[PDB]
């Protein structure tokens, strides 16, 4: 069937810019496309249809172009209030199909992480388990690794990663990590990394902790 | 044939222009010295008393030269010894005259007539509606009768065109519809579409099956479907309308087709495989609608006042559009070059005669516009410096005037080269 | 009048292989004039649209989305402005927010107004009341662990809603049908441990309220 695809899965932008997100059909659709914007827990809102039509009530910076295949919704003088998820739809044919969407990232300066690492509690060793946890706190860009190396041996395996959207205040990103284990295989190694290698520092910042001096 | 049409074109336009500009000098007493056409050198000059006339190679532009235009000469056919009003009235007199070719020829052509489509003069039958769209949302059976819309008073599908825009313009939005079935006034509420930009109301008018063309090598012209003839049914399924041709290729989607057709009175069961084509994934026959107008003429003074109010009318849009561009609301890469107006000038010859005169006046009203807008070293400058000069009361300092007409060439440098790089990227898609 | 609104009920948690009707109560318009959707929205996946209905003038019939043709069933109620959803055979990935939504007139179906939406998860794990765990080690970061709870969804505040400034609730992550979740907060080291700081959970699927004291440990 036909196939929205949106190429970009994330787009950064400043207040008061002009941005242009693109959206690619499968195939000829002529002009029976529609787009909404939805903000994080709330429904989508329809801003332009007919490729080119503002819907009532849309401010006049929201513009809608493109014929074929490669339609384009371009924001002039980008607003704080803009932030949110964008996305197409063509109705052509049946069955109707939407694009995967596009979020809006604000630009800002680079800023290293604040990391801390956090061994097991009594509580989780008492019940049996053991987790590590490592938070990165306050960076900048998005993009960012982490490796867990235990002695010196990787410990990919039972590694757990979860990363939080845009903050709304800073603007900045952050991540925990969580490593559960046996309380046999956490008496088993000594030295516990959460070495975090990120663009804003030519080496990795380091932080460990071992068992055994504690 | 494109090349030399946009040539001649673009000849006799600045033919007029600058003939204008003669007359008009010449009702104000002052010798005229160079009438070039075009640029370059001179590729043929006859003379004629004072008047050198000469035509050139390059035929880009096209320049005349008067007699002590801005030099401090007293003699009396002198331009610069004129009054400041006189003066503008030769700034003016050029495209004054490419806006009365214009409409002089907008005239003509209407009053020689025009093949208007033969569906807009017949009452309004709906023959089809489009699937999923307003009308059929509203619930418009086809064969209905449309016979009130708001409101205006409708009879035949220009009325109906005629009331939708000036609803679109008026910017409403419900209006109130009055339609006949078997005779029963229904009354309905239909949802004003933006026709202004293109959608519409998904009307179709009643079309009679039969084929005017086919396209070379498609395999509807390998079974031998000549164009001029007609269908009656498509694998024994009843078709009174070409677009119930188009549904059925529409939901064919590939399978085998048996068409039975009358070639001019015989019965032929024509096999035929409209697959998906590769092109677009999609049935392909390669055939083509027998399009039926109807050519209308028009009395003089009708065709006249029609002519005034449409070059009213798209002077109107082109002012808007230079309004918008002025304020960037449309990209620049829009404009008209050399280029694109010598192809388009082609496809105008690959189109018909009335076609050469219709965009003919287009590209004269589009000059004629280009050369008001206030540029230094353009039709439209030379008023700014005269309007000026006569507000103060004393002429432009000469070093002043020196400046102006160094920045006035390199900016129109700079727009040529623009536009040339606009035309070249137009050329590549 | 009233503006267009559209309410949608019937979510929850639900076992495979079930069936359910969902629905959706619209106020504020002519109901039986406009088309009527059940586009879906994944979690993290693309809107989906499932099915539509026509208006009364073309006999309310309905279109599907042909993966669905013969699962899933809409339809309209006789007497009220209530629009329903049957699904059966119901599986995993069936998990996501249904929305429902009013459709312009314009020239091919759009959907201009949409419903808050209601959120559907299917599976076999049985609700699990979580496990709190306290996380502790200039500026500090301390946090709270919310560990072994189904389903959704958890709220976590810190000391009862006074600290709000520099909070950071991680989504949840599923492993093994049971999911994780963890909090974090930064305060200065003059603020602690001189004041005390306390996690509070709650998980109003399983009627659970937890306060957690963080007390220093030996390292
Ligand atoms: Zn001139």
């Given at each position: 069937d036909i196939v929205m695809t949106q190429s970009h899965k994330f787009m950064s932008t400043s207040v008061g810019d002009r941005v242009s997100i693109t959206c690619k059909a499968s195939q000829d659709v002529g002009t029976d496309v529609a787009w909404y914007q939805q903000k994080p827990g709330q429904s989508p809102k329809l801003l332009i249809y007919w490729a080119s039509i503002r819907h009532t009530g849309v401010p006049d910076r929201f513009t809608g172009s493109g014929s074929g295949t490669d339609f384009t919704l371009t924001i002039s003088n980008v607003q704080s209030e803009d932030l949110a998820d964008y996305f197409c739809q063509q109705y052509s044919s049946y069955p109707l199909t939407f694009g995967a969407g596009t979020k809006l990232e604000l630009e800002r300066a680079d800023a290293a992480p604040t990391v801390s690492i956090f061994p097991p509690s009594s509580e989780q060793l008492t019940s049996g388990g053991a987790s590590v946890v490592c938070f990165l706190n306050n960076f900048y860009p998005k993009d960012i690794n982490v490796k867990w190396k235990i002695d010196g041996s990787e410990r990919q395996n039972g590694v757990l990663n979860s990363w939080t959207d845009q903050d709304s205040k800073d603007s900045t990103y952050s991540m925990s990590s969580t490593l559960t284990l046996t309380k046999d295989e956490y008496e088993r190694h000594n030295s516990y990394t959460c070495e975090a290698t990120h663009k804003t520092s030519t080496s990795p910042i380091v932080k460990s902790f071992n068992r055994n001096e504690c | 044939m494109g090349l030399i049409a946009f040539l001649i074109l673009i000849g006799v336009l600045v033919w007029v222009h600058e003939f204008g500009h003669f007359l008009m000098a010449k009702l104000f007493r002052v010798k005229v010295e160079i009438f070039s056409i075009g640029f370059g050198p001179p590729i043929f000059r006859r003379q004629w008393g004072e008047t050198v006339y000469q035509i050139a190679a390059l035929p880009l532009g096209g320049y005349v030269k008067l007699y002590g235009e801005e030099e401090n000469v007293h003699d009396?056919?002198?331009?610069?010894?004129?009054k400041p009003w006189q003066k503008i009235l030769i700034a003016l007199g050029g495209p004054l005259f490419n806006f009365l070719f214009t409409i002089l020829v907008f005239a003509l052509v209407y009053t020689a007539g025009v093949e208007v489509p033969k569906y807009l003069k017949e009452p309004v039958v709906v023959g089809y509606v489009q699937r999923d769209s307003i009308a059929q949302k509203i619930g418009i059976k086809p064969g209905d009768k449309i016979i009130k819309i708001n409101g205006y008073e409708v009879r035949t599908w220009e009325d109906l065109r005629d009331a939708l825009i000036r609803l679109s313009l008026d910017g409403v939005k419900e209006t109130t519809l009055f339609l006949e079935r078997n005779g029963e006034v229904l009354h309905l509420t239909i949802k004003v579409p933006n026709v202004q930009k293109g959608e519409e109301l998904g009307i179709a008018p009643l079309v009679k099956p039969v084929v005017g063309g086919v396209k070379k090598g498609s395999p509807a012209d390998q079974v031998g479907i000549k164009p001029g003839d007609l269908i009656l049914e498509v694998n024994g399924k009843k078709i009174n309308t070409w677009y119930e041709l188009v549904e059925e290729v529409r939901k064919s989607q590939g399978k085998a087709i048996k068409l039975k057709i009358l070639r001019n009175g015989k019965m032929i069961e024509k096999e035929l495989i409209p697959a998906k084509d590769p092109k677009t994934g999609t049935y392909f026959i390669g055939l083509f609608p027998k399009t039926e107008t109807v050519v209308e003429k028009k009395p003089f003074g009708e065709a006249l006042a029609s002519a005034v109010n449409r070059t009213w009318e798209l002077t109107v849009l082109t002012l808007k559009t230079i309004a918008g561009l002025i304020t960037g609301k449309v990209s620049f890469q829009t404009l008209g070059g050399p280029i694109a107006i010598a192809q388009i000038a082609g496809q105008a010859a690959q189109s018909g005669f009335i076609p050469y005169l219709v965009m003919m006046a287009f590209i004269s009203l589009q000059l004629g516009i280009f050369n008001l807008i206030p540029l230094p070293i353009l039709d439209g400058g030379l008023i700014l410096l005269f309007a000026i000069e006569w507000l103060r009361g004393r002429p432009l300092p000469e070093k002043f005037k020196e400046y102006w007409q160094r920045v006035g060439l390199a900016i129109i440098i700079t727009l040529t080269i623009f536009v040339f790089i606009n035309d070249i990227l137009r050329l590549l898609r | 009048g009233s503006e267009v609104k559209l309410v949608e009920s019937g979510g929850g948690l639900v076992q495979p292989g079930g069936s359910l009707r969902l629905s959706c109560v619209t106020s504020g318009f002519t109901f039986t004039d406009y088309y009527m959707s059940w586009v879906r929205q994944p979690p993290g996946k693309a809107l989906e649209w499932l099915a539509f209905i026509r208006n009364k003038v073309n006999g309310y019939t309905t279109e599907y989305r042909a993966s669905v043709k013969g699962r899933f069933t809409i339809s309209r109620d006789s007497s009220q402005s209530i629009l329903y959803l049957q699904v059966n055979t119901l599986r995993a990935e069936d998990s996501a927010t249904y929305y429902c939504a009013r459709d312009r007139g314009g020239n091919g179906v759009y959907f201009d107004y949409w419903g808050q939406g209601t959120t559907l998860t299917v599976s076999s794990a049985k609700t699990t009341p979580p496990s709190v765990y306290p996380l502790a080690p200039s500026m500090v970061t301390l946090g709270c662990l919310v560990k072994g709870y189904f389903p959704e969804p958890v709220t976590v505040t810190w000391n009862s809603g006074s600290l709000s400034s520099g909070v950071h609730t991680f989504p949840a992550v599923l492993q093994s049908d049971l999911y994780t979740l963890s909090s974090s907060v930064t305060v200065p080291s003059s603020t602690w441990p001189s004041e005390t700081v306390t996690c509070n959970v709650a998980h109003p699927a399983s009627s659970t309220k937890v306060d957690k004291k963080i007390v220093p440990r030996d390292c």
């Amino acid at each position: 069937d036909i196939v929205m695809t949106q190429s970009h899965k994330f787009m950064s932008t400043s207040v008061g810019d002009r941005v242009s997100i693109t959206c690619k059909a499968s195939q000829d659709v002529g002009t029976d496309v529609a787009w909404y914007q939805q903000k994080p827990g709330q429904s989508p809102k329809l801003l332009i249809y007919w490729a080119s039509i503002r819907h009532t009530g849309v401010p006049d910076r929201f513009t809608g172009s493109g014929s074929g295949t490669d339609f384009t919704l371009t924001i002039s003088n980008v607003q704080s209030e803009d932030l949110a998820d964008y996305f197409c739809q063509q109705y052509s044919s049946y069955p109707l199909t939407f694009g995967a969407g596009t979020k809006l990232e604000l630009e800002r300066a680079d800023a290293a992480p604040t990391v801390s690492i956090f061994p097991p509690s009594s509580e989780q060793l008492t019940s049996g388990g053991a987790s590590v946890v490592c938070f990165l706190n306050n960076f900048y860009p998005k993009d960012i690794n982490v490796k867990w190396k235990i002695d010196g041996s990787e410990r990919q395996n039972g590694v757990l990663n979860s990363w939080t959207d845009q903050d709304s205040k800073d603007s900045t990103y952050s991540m925990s990590s969580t490593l559960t284990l046996t309380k046999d295989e956490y008496e088993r190694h000594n030295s516990y990394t959460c070495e975090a290698t990120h663009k804003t520092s030519t080496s990795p910042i380091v932080k460990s902790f071992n068992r055994n001096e504690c | 044939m494109g090349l030399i049409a946009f040539l001649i074109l673009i000849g006799v336009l600045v033919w007029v222009h600058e003939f204008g500009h003669f007359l008009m000098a010449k009702l104000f007493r002052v010798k005229v010295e160079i009438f070039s056409i075009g640029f370059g050198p001179p590729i043929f000059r006859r003379q004629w008393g004072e008047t050198v006339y000469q035509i050139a190679a390059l035929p880009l532009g096209g320049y005349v030269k008067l007699y002590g235009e801005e030099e401090n000469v007293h003699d009396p056919r002198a331009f610069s010894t004129k009054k400041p009003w006189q003066k503008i009235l030769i700034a003016l007199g050029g495209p004054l005259f490419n806006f009365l070719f214009t409409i002089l020829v907008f005239a003509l052509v209407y009053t020689a007539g025009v093949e208007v489509p033969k569906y807009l003069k017949e009452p309004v039958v709906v023959g089809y509606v489009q699937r999923d769209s307003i009308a059929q949302k509203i619930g418009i059976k086809p064969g209905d009768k449309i016979i009130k819309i708001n409101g205006y008073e409708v009879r035949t599908w220009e009325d109906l065109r005629d009331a939708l825009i000036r609803l679109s313009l008026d910017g409403v939005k419900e209006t109130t519809l009055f339609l006949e079935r078997n005779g029963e006034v229904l009354h309905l509420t239909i949802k004003v579409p933006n026709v202004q930009k293109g959608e519409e109301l998904g009307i179709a008018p009643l079309v009679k099956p039969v084929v005017g063309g086919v396209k070379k090598g498609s395999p509807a012209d390998q079974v031998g479907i000549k164009p001029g003839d007609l269908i009656l049914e498509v694998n024994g399924k009843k078709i009174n309308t070409w677009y119930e041709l188009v549904e059925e290729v529409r939901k064919s989607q590939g399978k085998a087709i048996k068409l039975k057709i009358l070639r001019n009175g015989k019965m032929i069961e024509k096999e035929l495989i409209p697959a998906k084509d590769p092109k677009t994934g999609t049935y392909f026959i390669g055939l083509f609608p027998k399009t039926e107008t109807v050519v209308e003429k028009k009395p003089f003074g009708e065709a006249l006042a029609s002519a005034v109010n449409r070059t009213w009318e798209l002077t109107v849009l082109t002012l808007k559009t230079i309004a918008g561009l002025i304020t960037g609301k449309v990209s620049f890469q829009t404009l008209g070059g050399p280029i694109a107006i010598a192809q388009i000038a082609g496809q105008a010859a690959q189109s018909g005669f009335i076609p050469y005169l219709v965009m003919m006046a287009f590209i004269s009203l589009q000059l004629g516009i280009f050369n008001l807008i206030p540029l230094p070293i353009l039709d439209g400058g030379l008023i700014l410096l005269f309007a000026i000069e006569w507000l103060r009361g004393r002429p432009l300092p000469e070093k002043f005037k020196e400046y102006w007409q160094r920045v006035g060439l390199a900016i129109i440098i700079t727009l040529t080269i623009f536009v040339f790089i606009n035309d070249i990227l137009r050329l590549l898609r | 009048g009233s503006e267009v609104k559209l309410v949608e009920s019937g979510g929850g948690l639900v076992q495979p292989g079930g069936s359910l009707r969902l629905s959706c109560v619209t106020s504020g318009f002519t109901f039986t004039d406009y088309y009527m959707s059940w586009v879906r929205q994944p979690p993290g996946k693309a809107l989906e649209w499932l099915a539509f209905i026509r208006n009364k003038v073309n006999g309310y019939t309905t279109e599907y989305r042909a993966s669905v043709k013969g699962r899933f069933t809409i339809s309209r109620d006789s007497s009220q402005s209530i629009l329903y959803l049957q699904v059966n055979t119901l599986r995993a990935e069936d998990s996501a927010t249904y929305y429902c939504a009013r459709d312009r007139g314009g020239n091919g179906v759009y959907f201009d107004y949409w419903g808050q939406g209601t959120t559907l998860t299917v599976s076999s794990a049985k609700t699990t009341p979580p496990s709190v765990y306290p996380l502790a080690p200039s500026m500090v970061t301390l946090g709270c662990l919310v560990k072994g709870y189904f389903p959704e969804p958890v709220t976590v505040t810190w000391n009862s809603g006074s600290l709000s400034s520099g909070v950071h609730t991680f989504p949840a992550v599923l492993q093994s049908d049971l999911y994780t979740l963890s909090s974090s907060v930064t305060v200065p080291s003059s603020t602690w441990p001189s004041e005390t700081v306390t996690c509070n959970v709650a998980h109003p699927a399983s009627s659970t309220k937890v306060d957690k004291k963080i007390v220093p440990r030996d390292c």
